[PDB]
Amino acid sequence: FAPAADPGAAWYLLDTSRSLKPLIYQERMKPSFTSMTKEDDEQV
Amino acid sequence: QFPKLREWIGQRVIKDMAAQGYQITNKLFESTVGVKRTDIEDDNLGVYGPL
Known part of the structure; x- marks a missing residue:
């Protein structure tokens, strides 16, 4: 498949x-955001 | 003022306030009468001078 003979x-x-x-x-969980304002409080 | 609470926080819809105005002119009002100078002095009964 995907062999690899290597030294170590x-x-x-x-x-x-x-x-x-x-x-x-x-983290982006603060209110007044774009995804939380325009959309339904969508966190990321 | 602000309108009713809508039913969608998803894809919120913005709105605007309506600026209302009322304009009125304060024109004057007047009324007057004419009288003689001698008659007011030639009146000992007190009338014609309560004007």
């Missing part, structure tokens, strides 16, 4: 990740 002990590995921004929780 060299100084560098495959398919490196880039954790630039950690998980940040953004």
